[PDB]
Amino acid sequence: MPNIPPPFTAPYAPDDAEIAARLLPASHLSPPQEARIHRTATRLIEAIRKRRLGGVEDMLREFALSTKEGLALMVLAEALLRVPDARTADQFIEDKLGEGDFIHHETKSTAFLVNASAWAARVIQPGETPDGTIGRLVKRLGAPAVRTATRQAMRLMGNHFVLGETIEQALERGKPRSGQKTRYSFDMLGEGARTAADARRYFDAYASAIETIGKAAGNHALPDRPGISVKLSALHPRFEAISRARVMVELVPQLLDLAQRAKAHDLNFTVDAEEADRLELSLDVIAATLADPSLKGWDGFGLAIQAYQKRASAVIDYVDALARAHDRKLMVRLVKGAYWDTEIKRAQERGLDGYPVFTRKAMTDLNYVACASKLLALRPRIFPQFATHNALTVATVLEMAEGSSGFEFQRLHGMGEALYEQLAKDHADIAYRTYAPVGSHRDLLAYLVRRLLENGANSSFVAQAADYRVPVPALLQRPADAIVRPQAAAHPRIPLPCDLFAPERRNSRGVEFGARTALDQLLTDVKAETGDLKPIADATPDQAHAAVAAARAGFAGWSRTPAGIRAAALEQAAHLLESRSAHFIALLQREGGKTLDDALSELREAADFCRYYAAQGRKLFGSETAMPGPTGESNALTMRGRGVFVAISPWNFPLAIFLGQVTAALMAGNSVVAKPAEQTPRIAREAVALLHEAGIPKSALYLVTGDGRIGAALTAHPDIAGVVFTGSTEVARSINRALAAKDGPIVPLIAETGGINAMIADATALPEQVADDVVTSAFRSAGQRCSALRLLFVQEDVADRMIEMVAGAARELKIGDPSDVATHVGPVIDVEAKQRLDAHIARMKTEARLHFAGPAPEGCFVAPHIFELTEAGQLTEEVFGPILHVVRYRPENLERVLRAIERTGYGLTLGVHSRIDDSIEAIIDRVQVGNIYVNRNMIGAVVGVQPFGGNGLSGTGPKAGGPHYLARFATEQTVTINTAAAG
Amino acid sequence: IYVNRNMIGAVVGVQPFGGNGLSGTGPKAGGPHYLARFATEQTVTINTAAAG
Amino acid sequence: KLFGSETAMPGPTGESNALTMRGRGVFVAISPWNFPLAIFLGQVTAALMAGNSVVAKPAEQTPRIAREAVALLHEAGIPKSALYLVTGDGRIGAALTAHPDIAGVVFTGSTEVARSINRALAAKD
Amino acid sequence: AYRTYAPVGSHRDLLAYLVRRLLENGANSSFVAQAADYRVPVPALLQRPADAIVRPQAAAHPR
Numbered sequence A: 001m002p003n004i005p006p007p008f009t010a011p012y013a014p015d016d017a018e019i020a021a022r023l024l025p026a027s028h029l030s031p032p033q034e035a036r037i038h039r040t041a042t043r044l045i046e047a048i049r050k051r052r053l054g055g056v057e058d059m060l061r062e063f064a065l066s067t068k069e070g071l072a073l074m075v076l077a078e079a080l081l082r083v084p085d086a087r088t089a090d091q092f093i094e095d096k097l098g099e100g101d102f103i104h105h106e107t108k109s110t111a112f113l114v115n116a117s118a119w120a121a122r123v124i125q126p127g128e129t130p131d132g133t134i135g136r137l138v139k140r141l142g143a144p145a146v147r148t149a150t151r152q153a154m155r156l157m158g159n160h161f162v163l164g165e166t167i168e169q170a171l172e173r174g175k176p177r178s179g180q181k182t183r184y185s186f187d188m189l190g191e192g193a194r195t196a197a198d199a200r201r202y203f204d205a206y207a208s209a210i211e212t213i214g215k216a217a218g219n220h221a222l223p224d225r226p227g228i229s230v231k232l233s234a235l236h237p238r239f240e241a242i243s244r245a246r247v248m249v250e251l252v253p254q255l256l257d258l259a260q261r262a263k264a265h266d267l268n269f270t271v272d273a274e275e276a277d278r279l280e281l282s283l284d285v286i287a288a289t290l291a292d293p294s295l296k297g298w299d300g301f302g303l304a305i306q307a308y309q310k311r312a313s314a315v316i317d318y319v320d321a322l323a324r325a326h327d328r329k330l331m332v333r334l335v336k337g338a339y340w341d342t343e344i345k346r347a348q349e350r351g352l353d354g355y356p357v358f359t360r361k362a363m364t365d366l367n368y369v370a371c372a373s374k375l376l377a378l379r380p381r382i383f384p385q386f387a388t389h390n391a392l393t394v395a396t397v398l399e400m401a402e403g404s405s406g407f408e409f410q411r412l413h414g415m416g417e418a419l420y421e422q423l424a425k426d427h428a429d430i431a432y433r434t435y436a437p438v439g440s441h442r443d444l445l446a447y448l449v450r451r452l453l454e455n456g457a458n459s460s461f462v463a464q465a466a467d468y469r470v471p472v473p474a475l476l477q478r479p480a481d482a483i484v485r486p487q488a489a490a491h492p493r494i495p496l497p498c499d500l501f502a503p504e505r506r507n508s509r510g511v512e513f514g515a516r517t518a519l520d521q522l523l524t525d526v527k528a529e530t531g532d533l534k535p536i537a538d539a540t541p542d543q544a545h546a547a548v549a550a551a552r553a554g555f556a557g558w559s560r561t562p563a564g565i566r567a568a569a570l571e572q573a574a575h576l577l578e579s580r581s582a583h584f585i586a587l588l589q590r591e592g593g594k595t596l597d598d599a600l601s602e603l604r605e606a607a608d609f610c611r612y613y614a615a616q617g618r619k620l621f622g623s624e625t626a627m628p629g630p631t632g633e634s635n636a637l638t639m640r641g642r643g644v645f646v647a648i649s650p651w652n653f654p655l656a657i658f659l660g661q662v663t664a665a666l667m668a669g670n671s672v673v674a675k676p677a678e679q680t681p682r683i684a685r686e687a688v689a690l691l692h693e694a695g696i697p698k699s700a701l702y703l704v705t706g707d708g709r710i711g712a713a714l715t716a717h718p719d720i721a722g723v724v725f726t727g728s729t730e731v732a733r734s735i736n737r738a739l740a741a742k743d744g745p746i747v748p749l750i751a752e753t754g755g756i757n758a759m760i761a762d763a764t765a766l767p768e769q770v771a772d773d774v775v776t777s778a779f780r781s782a783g784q785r786c787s788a789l790r791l792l793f794v795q796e797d798v799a800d801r802m803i804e805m806v807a808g809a810a811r812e813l814k815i816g817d818p819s820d821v822a823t824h825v826g827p828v829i830d831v832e833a834k835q836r837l838d839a840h841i842a843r844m845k846t847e848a849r850l851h852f853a854g855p856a857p858e859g860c861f862v863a864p865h866i867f868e869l870t871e872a873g874q875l876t877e878e879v880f881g882p883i884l885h886v887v888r889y890r891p892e893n894l895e896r897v898l899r900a901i902e903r904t905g906y907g908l909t910l911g912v913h914s915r916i917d918d919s920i921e922a923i924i925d926r927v928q929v930g931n932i933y934v935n936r937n938m939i940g941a942v943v944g945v946q947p948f949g950g951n952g953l954s955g956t957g958p959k960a961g962g963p964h965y966l967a968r969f970a971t972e973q974t975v976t977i978n979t980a981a982a983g
Numbered sequence B: 001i002y003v004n005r006n007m008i009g010a011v012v013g014v015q016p017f018g019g020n021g022l023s024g025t026g027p028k029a030g031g032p033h034y035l036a037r038f039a040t041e042q043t044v045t046i047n048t049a050a051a052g
Numbered sequence C: 001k002l003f004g005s006e007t008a009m010p011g012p013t014g015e016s017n018a019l020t021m022r023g024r025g026v027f028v029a030i031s032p033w034n035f036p037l038a039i040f041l042g043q044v045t046a047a048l049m050a051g052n053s054v055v056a057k058p059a060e061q062t063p064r065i066a067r068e069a070v071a072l073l074h075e076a077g078i079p080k081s082a083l084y085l086v087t088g089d090g091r092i093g094a095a096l097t098a099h100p101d102i103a104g105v106v107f108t109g110s111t112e113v114a115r116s117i118n119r120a121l122a123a124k125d
Numbered sequence D: 001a002y003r004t005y006a007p008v009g010s011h012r013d014l015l016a017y018l019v020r021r022l023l024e025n026g027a028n029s030s031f032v033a034q035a036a037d038y039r040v041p042v043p044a045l046l047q048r049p050a051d052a053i054v055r056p057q058a059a060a061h062p063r
């Protein structure tokens, strides 16, 4: 009867200290309360340290394995467990494993997870160099220990996971005896559908699991019936804030169907909690689902809430209001949180104003107990479920319950066993639910990774309890006593994103699209910025020469302006850029045709260029360098501006590359004449006016607009001191020839040009991450980035799955007006671009296999295309659009692949996806490419982090946004003074 | 530039030597900017998150 | 200092970023007659130190010292495969600089010859 | 050929013997201890003694 709560919108990353100022006093307990807790917890830990077979943490500790090594052995273990004849596995383990074929075993066992037929008698030659994850393990531990470790992995995989090639096989394997109930609830493997077909498969798997669980549910009432865990990202291929409109329309009926099926068996149905940027969207979906009248009269629906998030307490308020408003009973799982490292990395990458999670473990522990107290007081409408394997957390929640009724604890099969058995011994009324991981092999890898991060974490309770160096009393330290003071809440060694580069420079600010207040405000601000797009008159060859003459006159004064003053101008420019981000983002979208995230990212990059060049500028030009020499003599090295630089920029980064080149030249003490791409003069003119306002003298910087002919007039001018160019390889050569033709000084040419960028993915790569990174690298910004992926090499054993996943993912990209927040792929720059792209597409259709040709809206649009080539040699040009080419290869032919890459002459970006350090390192050793990206996408180089730029046909160097850039814009001068007369 | 002494016999690492304009491109021989010009830069970026 | 080890770049947690400097390829080194030893070796050893192989063409007037110098470099630890001496006039110098496979040119000599070399480089595709 | 010895005697002589025995099994520098610690890579157990000393003047322990 109460009002349905408003869409959830708590502040994303509030101040830790203020939260601690509330939680610390409230955490206080009386001496008798603490005494009970201490006793219960000691008893739990004693049982834990009894020592049963063991868990993953025991294996990692026993053989001192990295997470990567643990993962590789568990993968090999599953492959070995699925071999029909156990004697067959035994023979392999003793005779082949650890003897050789190290990389082959790692590759085959991993491919097995997506391609069962891939894993099936070789002959191992002696003396093989131990390489690969397994070979390195063998060198370190010895082959016999690796076999022993593998056998242990086999008992872990066989005992603690319910797995099969398909869901049906997993479910059959996980069944109980007869007319009996499953002793476990199902933690389903699936997450993050990449394709529409993935989302249907996961839906079907859940549906199938619900029937299996149902038919073996027992006759008791809730809470004493089994549960299933479900992930929203598994049920929708673009589960994200910017796609909220389609998500609400497509995902809800799906989740509703599954909830109804669970209701019919009167099951516990739990929606898992995922990344922080999906919190708000998930609550929207969950609320709309819960509202459906078909879910009345059922008490099993629920969701997980992560206490490691500052928003946790507010989520609980929201969930309770939801429950009262629809008059429902809910089962609510409280967890700490499984994605901590991800949240830290993301907030840093995204330049957020803070972290959505606590950064000290004790703060998470404090907030968990505080949230538990909150949930307990919401009984009986809310049935709390405390999922944790921490003995102190358990003991503390029990004490606060003052009873054992109306809540449960939870644990994952293979963890918390000794703990909860002992808890049950000491408290007969206590209930705990045990979940088993259940699913297909194709979903194992993604799940194993997350699982291993936590079992291998030093801070984890389970790990420490298993380490007998850690005394029992240490595991019993109260969280409040670790924090002591509110101002100590945040972790002292984790800087806020804005301080990522301190004390060098400030970081530009970003926006969290997953926070509706932030995204809505950004959208509004950009919308408020208007632009009719008035034509910008071209310059005549006379005006261009006048510009050079004027720049030439201004060089004397600018070059002699103190470096600190030049740097201050750049830094004020950065300030004005971010201050006016909406205006410039608006321009980037209108004139540049960029989607919102690409525009914001370019704005950030522009400001980063200013601050970074300002910072490097002071180091380089701030003072002379004293040279060692004899007594009675001084020797000083200085760097002076060269003269007038001509800066020529492209249309694809009309602001950041424009400003990067210009501010670099300016910082070095040069005056500049800048000619922007014909397509994007407006933003260039805005940038220049901004630089002037920031402190760049009118006499130091001139904008000349026009075509390649006006650009030619500038580069041919006899009085210029150098040229900084970014554009086509062909135009660079033309400029270079015009420069070399002159009889004057040989001036510097910095030329950054295209590439035919490859990615190499082997069978140890996670197909879902490959697909993400391939889709991003090749199709983001309509493939109009120089760093963009053009050629994917994929090992044949995984080619079909990887290609199919990229295609399915590409189909989910929204193509259209870049100003619509839901758009993934905007238009290409002009009619000429589209025609050239369409011509290549037409040609490729008659020369190579078409895997995907997306649907494009009328206008200057080109959709993602995927072609498979017979050989790489079929791709001979940089095609500047959303067009992926794929070649599959045999593992023994990597050399051929590397020759194919070397053959083009380009060398800008290269992607490598592989678990195998030795393979990654062999590739790096071999290639000369400027930017190599491993196990991530190939785009969005960050100033001062990924100095960007290639060689061969891809560029001259030095790398923009790196420490060798500014020097190229200057000239050296040595002053030697005989000082002897001074004495 | 040489002040109150002769103009010749630049010493390696003391007087980085070489000119501009019609006199040269740089970087100066026997100075700290020379070697870099003979090399190319390579940036290697690795997503290490799977390990921690 | 420069090539001894990589430079770590600041970045987000969960990511490593390292800057390295690698040899470019084959450098053509062309030297004058007026400092037949020191400028010859200066240019040659700089290129070698940066990890390039080198084809060196000495001034036609002073091949002997250059050949003695190359011999000394080989004896000092420079592999025969990393360093070759080619003697002759400006035409042989022109052949070297015109070669499509070279990765750079280090030259000391007349402003006029520098420009012709610059033009030959620019002319290549 | 290898000979295996068994400790043989009366309880009244055990303590004195156990002490000496435990000093060596609990020593960080002991081969048996390190071999049993999987953090120590096989190649580490294989370092030649001469390569640890390197120079005559480094023979004595510096601390």
Ligand SMILES: Cc1cc2nc3c(=O)[nH]c(=O)nc-3n(C[C@H](O)[C@H](O)[C@H](O)COP(=O)(O)OP(=O)(O)OC[C@H]3O[C@@H](n4cnc5c(N)ncnc54)[C@H](O)[C@@H]3O)c2cc1C
Residues within 6 Å of the ligand: A271, A272, A273, A274, A304, A306, A308, A335, A336, A337, A338, A339, A340, A357, A358, A359, A360, A361, A362, A363, A364, A387, A388, A389, A390, A393, A410, A411, A412, A435, A454, A459, A460, A461, A462, A491
């Ligand atoms: C049945 C079950 C279902 C679960 N469902 C989900 C889910 O849907 N979504 C989800 O995100 N998690 C979920 N989890 C939680 C996750 O998988 C881990 O098990 C959990 O976070 C560990 O908490 P703990 O009290 O057992 O271990 P503890 O060792 O006491 O705490 C470990 C954790 O503290 C936090 N942490 C670690 N370092 C820091 C730091 N420097 N600063 C702040 N916090 C830190 C983390 O959240 C981390 O996992 C579930 C767990 C179980 C058992």
Ligand SMILES: Cc1cc2nc3c(=O)[nH]c(=O)nc-3n(C[C@H](O)[C@H](O)[C@H](O)COP(=O)(O)OP(=O)(O)OC[C@H]3O[C@@H](n4cnc5c(N)ncnc54)[C@H](O)[C@@H]3O)c2cc1C
Residues within 6 Å of the ligand: D005, D024, D029, D030, D031, D032, D061
């Ligand atoms: C059957 C048998 C009978 C034995 N009888 C005797 C005996 O009668 N008298 C006797 O004294 N020992 C005797 N020992 C030796 C002793 O008991 C140890 O077993 C032995 O010294 C260990 O050598 P190791 O090569 O097996 O182990 P390792 O780990 O290779 O070496 C361990 C040892 O190196 C030496 N050492 C350790 N640290 C240092 C240091 N900082 N500087 C210099 N040296 C160091 C010690 O001698 C020490 O025991 C006997 C051993 C066996 C197996």
Ligand SMILES: NC(=O)c1ccc[n+]([C@@H]2O[C@H](COP(=O)([O-])OP(=O)(O)OC[C@H]3O[C@@H](n4cnc5c(N)ncnc54)[C@H](O)[C@@H]3O)[C@@H](O)[C@H]2O)c1
Residues within 6 Å of the ligand: A648, A649, A650, A651, A652, A653, A657, A675, A676, A677, A678, A706, A707, A708, A709, A711, A712, A715, A726, A727, A728, A729, A730, A731, A732, A734, A735, A752, A753, A754, A755, A785, A786, A787, A878, A880, A908, A948, A949, A950, A954, A955
């Ligand atoms: N390596 C990098 O960092 C990087 C960054 C951005 C773009 N690019 C490259 O730029 C290309 C796409 O952008 P584009 O179409 O604008 O490049 P483009 O060669 O077509 O022209 C770019 C710029 O040079 C000017 N220009 C054209 N002809 C000229 C001439 N004869 N003399 C002097 N100037 C002349 C243009 O008018 C313009 O401002 C791709 O090949 C791409 O990979 C490389």
Ligand SMILES: NC(=O)c1ccc[n+]([C@@H]2O[C@H](COP(=O)([O-])OP(=O)(O)OC[C@H]3O[C@@H](n4cnc5c(N)ncnc54)[C@H](O)[C@@H]3O)[C@@H](O)[C@H]2O)c1
Residues within 6 Å of the ligand: B017, B018, B019, B023, B024, C030, C031, C032, C033, C034, C035, C039, C057, C058, C059, C060, C088, C089, C090, C091, C092, C093, C094, C097, C108, C109, C110, C111, C112, C113, C114, C116, C117
């Ligand atoms: N700035 C300095 O550091 C420095 C140092 C020493 C000498 N120099 C200059 O060197 C000059 C005098 O000596 P030089 O007579 O040997 O110079 P030079 O121009 O006559 O030629 C010198 C070198 O280039 C080669 N060469 C000639 N024509 C060539 C061509 N068309 N293509 C490729 N290579 C060619 C020669 O055979 C020789 O090895 C002066 O102008 C002097 O100032 C400058």
